[PDB]
Structure 1
Amino acid sequence: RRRSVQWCTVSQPEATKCFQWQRNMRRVRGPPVSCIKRDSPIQCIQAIAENRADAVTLDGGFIYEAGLAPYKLRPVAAEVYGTERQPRTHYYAVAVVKKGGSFQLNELQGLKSCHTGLRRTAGWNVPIGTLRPFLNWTGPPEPIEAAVARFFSASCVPGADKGQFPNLCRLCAGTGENKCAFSSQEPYFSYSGAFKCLRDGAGDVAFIRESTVFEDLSDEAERDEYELLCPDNTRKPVDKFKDCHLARVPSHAVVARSVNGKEDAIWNLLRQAQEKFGKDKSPKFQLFGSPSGQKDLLFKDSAIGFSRVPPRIDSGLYLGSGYFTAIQNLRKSEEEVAARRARVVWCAVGEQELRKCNQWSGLSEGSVTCSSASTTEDCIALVLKGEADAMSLDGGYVYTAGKCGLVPVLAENYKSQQSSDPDPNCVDRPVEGYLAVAVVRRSDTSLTWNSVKGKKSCHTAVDRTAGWNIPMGLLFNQTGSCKFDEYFSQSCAPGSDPRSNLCALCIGDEQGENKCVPNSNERYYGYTGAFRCLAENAGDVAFVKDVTVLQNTDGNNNDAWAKDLKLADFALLCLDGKRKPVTEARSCHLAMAPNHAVVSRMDKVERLKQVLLHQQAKFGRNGSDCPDKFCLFQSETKNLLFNDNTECLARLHGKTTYEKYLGPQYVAGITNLKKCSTSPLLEACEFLRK
């Protein structure tokens, strides 16, 4: 499987460094590494895709391209920049000009520009995006490049087609067939090459990264001949880039295959080479250093190391919602872009949720369409990737979403703790929260809270509130043990490892497949599912909510299993040792659980609010188009999409973040449990926040 990593190159100078690295690794008896010779980034991406190479560092822009249809690569290790005191995995895209003229970012038409390359991050993807309003581009078949050519009088944009767009290669200084080329041959290529374009005075502006003026000018006197164009039509010095930049973007990263990518071997070689040939490690070879006339050979010069990129992260999540969809927008009209801007894409966990969602989309008047995934976490990933937008989450999943940057918008407002009748001001009524309780059969009279451990259990699903966070949370306060799979003997807790004791009692869907998956296909998933687990004498205790018991007994649920059950056949376990009836939950419950909340991005908050409020006026609880057509909070006690016992989606009253909504100490509770184990998505977002 691994005994030599193949590193793809794009240049003769680049191949020579590759060979140096090869023989210095041999010099020190460390990890081997072969070298491949190609002529361009796209060729190396193809190379890796057909097992003819292993890995290649690529700019943000080419991470996107490397992750699409045929190839499907992913970032396995990102570059690190800045100082050892303050390492970062991100850089800034700026626009450096000379000192003299008095123009601004909005006064660039008619001027001459100096870019790094086509489809690069700082060089194309950001500048063209910031300047789109000024381009007067009409949209598709006409390439965006064409509009740029009319904008700037002349410029050098390596990689551009000289023949179709001659204006974009006027100021490049290559000779013959090397003019406007995507290689070192063309003098004004990459960061240092584009600042040289500024230098010579060919261009008037140069779109590069922030550290480029510091890398090429020695004395601090030569740097005071340059300022930075700002988004707010202002000029400032080259050291105030923090407060003056076009964008904030991910760093370049070593990519590789998704399926058999030899991730292990890539990281092993990179860390070893980071330790023996990193920042001033050995004068006989420099990993992050190149000869005089060359620049940024195999990795970025003046880099300080690598930093492993977590398994769950893909091309898109890496690039982040802001930059990822911006790349996507360059291949779209202004009409298509603002149209997506104003529609809400709900995510659906499971085919059953998906089916209810399509019904809603048909009657939404094109304000809602749907996406889908097999689990809750996968759907959160989709909102970060910009493919989806919103979704109703249980308090437990609000934390995970919370640490991935999403925020709460509207929360489910269940019938109040006996306050009013079908409340008119439900939308402005503050949320009271629901009650987490434990449930058992009457016949088993010896079962109490002090002896529930050891018996079979019926959970909703892992990382949910009443199902997991609270029951395991109290049991953790006592024992302290992080092994949650020994608390109960056998149990059904969807989301857990299927060959685990935690999935032993699950039964899957009607065919017998899908055991212990955390969507509604599992018969015993969710509140209704956990109670079902109880009633059928699969488990002994079942951690759901009070109203779940009510809603599934005394003929309130006409399905096969719940047809003949009655409310008096069930009791609740109290913390003191006592047991009461289900109606006495107010005085016999484990803890208060905060309401479910519909979350989205910070950029989709205002439109999502005016849409949900409108759609609920139509298909709500007291909705005008209710029974006849469709109802949002109605799916026949399966809780598809929203909870059935939801009155209305309500405002949060200033609790606008995951911290303020859940509550200080609820967040404390979750974190402690997460110390024993984090999810791959939790590990993913943690990387991206740094």
Structure 2
Amino acid sequence: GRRRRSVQWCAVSQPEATKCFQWQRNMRRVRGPPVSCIKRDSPIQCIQAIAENRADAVTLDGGFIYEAGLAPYKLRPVAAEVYGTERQPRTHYYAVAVVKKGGSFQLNELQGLKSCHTGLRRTAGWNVPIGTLRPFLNWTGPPEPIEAAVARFFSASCVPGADKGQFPNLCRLCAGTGENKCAFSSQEPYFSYSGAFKCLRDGAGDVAFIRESTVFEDLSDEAERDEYELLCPDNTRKPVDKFKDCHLARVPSHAVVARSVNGKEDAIWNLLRQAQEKFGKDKSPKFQLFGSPSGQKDLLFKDSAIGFSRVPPRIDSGLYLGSGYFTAIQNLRKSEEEVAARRARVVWCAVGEQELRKCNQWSGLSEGSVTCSSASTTEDCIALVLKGEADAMSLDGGYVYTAGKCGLVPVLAENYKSQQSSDPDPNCVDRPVEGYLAVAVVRRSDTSLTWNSVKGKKSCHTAVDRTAGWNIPMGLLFNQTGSCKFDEYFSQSCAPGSDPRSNLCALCIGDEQGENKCVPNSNERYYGYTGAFRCLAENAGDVAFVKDVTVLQNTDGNNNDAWAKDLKLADFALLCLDGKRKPVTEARSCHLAMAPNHAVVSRMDKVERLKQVLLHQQAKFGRNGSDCPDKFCLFQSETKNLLFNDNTECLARLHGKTTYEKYLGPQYVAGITNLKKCSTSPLLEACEFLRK
């Protein structure tokens, strides 16, 4: 037969353990998957237990998801709590500031007042309120903890888990008896959402920092809910049911975490899917997964949560938290000077070592304004910008699709020499973009090869998901065949970013030492426009999917690299969609499609600053730049197209095309959306979940 010992759940107190044991027997009784219980005293202790295989799983507030994701622990959210109603379920909630009706004070008039918080380091109880209130605190920055600043700001507080000895003021309102006063557990009555609300009901505090549902969970009579109002960020008060218009932040729901390593994801999800169906929202009078004995609240999971939702594998704690909240958490340990220096600075994302070296030279010359981050794929760079770890990169239109689905926006586009219509152009920055031509290049010798007989031959691609190299040729082919089976369009290929064991990687050669085969960065010698052309010129493939200028740039002594030095434009032809073949110089009547210019993308929070930096930087290191070619040229890398295309004339403005749909256009977006039905990336799955 088989075996599965169990999933080891960490409880953080005794009533938790109690509920965890009674869950255990109800799983055995109903014959479902087994869960066993571990006991600790704190979230941190559960995070520790899990990282050293003494437990599998624990539910955590967003604040502790952040902690859990740091080294040495490296934990990952695997399942989100779902709130709302089965009609309108949601994996987020709202941090609100609740007050009694009858006072005049607003969110900016809180000094000297008394406060009720759920707990130190918690989302709604601490991180959001304290980050919102920051400009009123007169905090000097480290080494003095921000706690000291809030201790002087409110006259008295209950902040469970605060240091009663260092910050006695933060524990003064706490209703705990003895050593239980101000503790991070239910021994302290004013702990967590309901505890903080009770601190307000009792009149112990003037303000409670809680979630939007607390007043509805704890007050059944709707006439008693009227005695309460919300503080809105626009310095007004509004009724408690108007939380959507009146909240301090919208935040990700609590999540079950697990090891990133041998995490047991499947068993945890298997247990949770089963537990939820059998003991969920009023399913069994035997046991309520999301209920707590009338002594207590929120044991193991949030009371009245309605289920779980599985977190896609690509999501780590930072992606889970979102750029806003993730960077806001980090900012609580930083001075306002440091925070404002990071806003001023542009962190570039480099894909691979070669782009990293060039970005490093730019950085040194940028007068503090540009710095560098790096990853081994473009998707990984996109993730770094979502975590606010990097800010910017230039992307092929195919990747702009992915970036946009993830919420990033185009800011400036690569502009290229204008079809015999502009000069060495003073007005490049405002000249609207013209697109580039996607072409199918073949050898002249290959007289019998046409568009019509291209299926089954050997193919060279820039990378998977790029415009000229992938989306256009494969999109045209998909339009005939109907087949999602992309690895059978051609006998063999180099298509970087594909499965190394597939036919799509067969012709890739990897680096100078034969490592990194089929890797979607410049280490693979066949990567990108230049590498897909090379793949053809060295007889690896029979067709290369590139742009017209690529052939021009790599023939007739235009590229003096060993592989390229003796190639002639006349040895190459284009495949036209009408089955004819033409010279490269006739691309205008023999191209597969027009591709949108590569664009620099970023987060919405960086757009204006990014524009100032890039415009200033290109004035110095651009084509007509003051310090180019003397010191450094941004748009030069000897046919390697590092960071930008080498034929970029300038970075230009978008003229209203400020979203990916407007920039790429409705036709191109339809095409890719179609292609993506055949298979989506982890990152796209990840972004779907995060945008819900």
Q: TM-score, normalised by structure 2?
A: 0.99
In 2, distance between residues paired with 1:623 and 1:2? 66
In 1, distance between residues paired with 2:48 and 2:77? 15
Please list the CA deviations of residues 463-513 of structure 1 after superposition, one character each: whole Å capped at 9, or x if unmatched: 000000000000000000000000000110000000000000000000011
- Partner secondary structure for residue 402 of structure 2: helix
Write out the 4+ residue segments of structure 1 that deviate beyond 6 Å after TM superposition: none
In 2, distance between residues paired with 1:637 and 1:218? 70
Please list the CA deviations of residues 534-577 of structure 1 after superposition, one character each: whole Å capped at 9, or x if unmatched: 00000000000000000000000000000000000000000001
1:350/1:373 contact within 8 Å kept: yes
- Partner secondary structure for residue 49 of structure 2: helix
In 1, distance between residues paired with 2:287 and 2:132? 40
- Partner secondary structure for residue 220 of structure 1: coil
Please list the CA deviations of residues 440-459 of structure 1 after superposition, one character each: whole Å capped at 9, or x if unmatched: 00111000000011100000
Please list the CA deviations of residues 367-412 of structure 1 after superposition, one character each: whole Å capped at 9, or x if unmatched: 0010000000000000000110000000000000010000000000
In 1, distance between residues paired with 2:575 and 2:455? 12
In 2, distance between residues paired with 1:30 and 1:522? 49
1:94/1:207 contact within 8 Å kept: yes
Are positions 1:418 and 2:423 aligned together?
Answer: no
In 2, distance between residues paired with 1:178 and 1:361? 53
- Partner secondary structure for residue 571 of structure 1: strand
In 2, distance between residues paired with 1:372 and 1:54? 32
- Partner secondary structure for residue 670 of structure 2: helix
In 2, distance between residues paired with 1:52 and 1:71? 13
In 2, distance between residues paired with 1:569 and 1:12? 79
Deviation at 1:262?
0.2
In 2, distance between residues paired with 1:583 and 1:58? 62
Please list the CA deviations of residues 142-191 of structure 1 after superposition, one character each: whole Å capped at 9, or x if unmatched: 00000000000001000000000000000001111000000000000000
Are positions 1:430 and 2:436 aligned together?
Answer: no
- Partner secondary structure for residue 470 of structure 1: helix
1:2/1:262 contact within 8 Å kept: no
Deviation at 1:420?
1.7
In 2, distance between residues paired with 1:294 and 1:454? 67
In 2, distance between residues paired with 1:270 and 1:607? 45
In 2, distance between residues paired with 1:207 and 1:628? 58
**Aligned residue in 1 for 2:219:** 217
Deviation at 1:293?
1.9
Please list the CA deviations of residues 90-127 of structure 1 after superposition, one character each: whole Å capped at 9, or x if unmatched: 00000000010100000000000000000000000000
Q: Give 5+ residue unaligned stretches, structure 2.
A: none
Are positions 1:319 and 2:340 aligned together?
Answer: no
1:156/1:172 contact within 8 Å kept: yes
In 2, distance between residues paired with 1:147 and 1:293? 35
In 1, distance between residues paired with 2:456 and 2:50? 52
Name the % identity: 100
In 2, distance between residues paired with 1:13 and 1:3? 24
* Correspondence for 2:269 among 264, 267, 283: 267
In 1, distance between residues paired with 2:558 and 2:443? 18
* Correspondence for 1:681 among 669, 683, 688: 683
In 2, distance between residues paired with 1:261 and 1:484? 33
**Aligned residue in 1 for 2:651:** 649
* Counterpart mapping for 1:71-150 below 5 A: 71-150=73-152
- Partner secondary structure for residue 242 of structure 2: coil
- Partner secondary structure for residue 224 of structure 1: helix
1:409/1:652 contact within 8 Å kept: yes
Please list the CA deviations of residues 253-295 of structure 1 after superposition, one character each: whole Å capped at 9, or x if unmatched: 0000001000000000000000000001100100000111200
In 2, distance between residues paired with 1:481 and 1:213? 54
1:22/1:33 contact within 8 Å kept: yes
Please list the CA deviations of residues 575-598 of structure 1 after superposition, one character each: whole Å capped at 9, or x if unmatched: 001000000000000100000000
- Partner secondary structure for residue 105 of structure 1: coil
In 2, distance between residues paired with 1:21 and 1:89? 24
**Aligned residue in 1 for 2:616:** 614
Please list the CA deviations of residues 294-331 of structure 1 after superposition, one character each: whole Å capped at 9, or x if unmatched: 00001000010000000000000000000000000000
Deviation at 1:69?
1.0
In 1, distance between residues paired with 2:170 and 2:56? 34
Deviation at 1:3?
3.0
1:158/1:169 contact within 8 Å kept: yes
- Partner secondary structure for residue 131 of structure 1: helix
In 1, distance between residues paired with 2:422 and 2:114? 68
Please list the CA deviations of residues 631-659 of structure 1 after superposition, one character each: whole Å capped at 9, or x if unmatched: 00011000000000000000000000000
- Partner secondary structure for residue 351 of structure 2: coil
- Partner secondary structure for residue 553 of structure 1: coil
In 1, distance between residues paired with 2:611 and 2:630? 25
In 1, distance between residues paired with 2:71 and 2:43? 16
- Partner secondary structure for residue 7 of structure 1: strand
In 1, distance between residues paired with 2:419 and 2:685? 38
| Worse-superposed segment, 417-426 or 223-232 | 417-426
1:461/1:468 contact within 8 Å kept: yes
1:213/1:223 contact within 8 Å kept: yes
Deviation at 1:68?
0.4
Deviation at 1:2?
4.2
In 2, distance between residues paired with 1:192 and 1:218? 14
Please list the CA deviations of residues 423-450 of structure 1 after superposition, one character each: whole Å capped at 9, or x if unmatched: 1100000000000000000111000000
In 2, distance between residues paired with 1:154 and 1:19? 39
**Cα root mean square deviation, aligned:** 0.5
In 2, distance between residues paired with 1:551 and 1:453? 27
* Correspondence for 2:546 among 541, 544, 547: 544
Are positions 1:20 and 2:22 aligned together?
Answer: yes
In 1, distance between residues paired with 2:438 and 2:246? 50
In 2, distance between residues paired with 1:411 and 1:50? 48
- Partner secondary structure for residue 371 of structure 2: strand
Q: TM-score, normalised by structure 1?
A: 1.00
In 2, distance between residues paired with 1:293 and 1:338? 47
Deviation at 1:626?
0.6
1:436/1:589 contact within 8 Å kept: yes
In 1, distance between residues paired with 2:205 and 2:493? 69
1:77/1:267 contact within 8 Å kept: yes
In 2, distance between residues paired with 1:195 and 1:304? 22
- Partner secondary structure for residue 503 of structure 1: coil
Work out the number of aligned pairs and report it.
690
* Correspondence for 1:351 among 341, 348, 353: 353
- Partner secondary structure for residue 544 of structure 1: strand
Deviation at 1:613?
0.2
In 1, distance between residues paired with 2:246 and 2:544? 56
* Counterpart mapping for 1:36-435 below 5 A: 36-435=38-437
In 2, distance between residues paired with 1:303 and 1:577? 61
Q: Give 5+ residue unaligned stretches, structure 1.
A: none
Deviation at 1:421?
1.2
Are positions 1:496 and 2:498 aligned together?
Answer: yes
In 2, distance between residues paired with 1:421 and 1:160? 66
Deviation at 1:6?
0.2
In 2, distance between residues paired with 1:80 and 1:469? 36
In 1, distance between residues paired with 2:213 and 2:587? 62
1:461/1:493 contact within 8 Å kept: yes
In 2, distance between residues paired with 1:174 and 1:498? 60
1:414/1:648 contact within 8 Å kept: yes
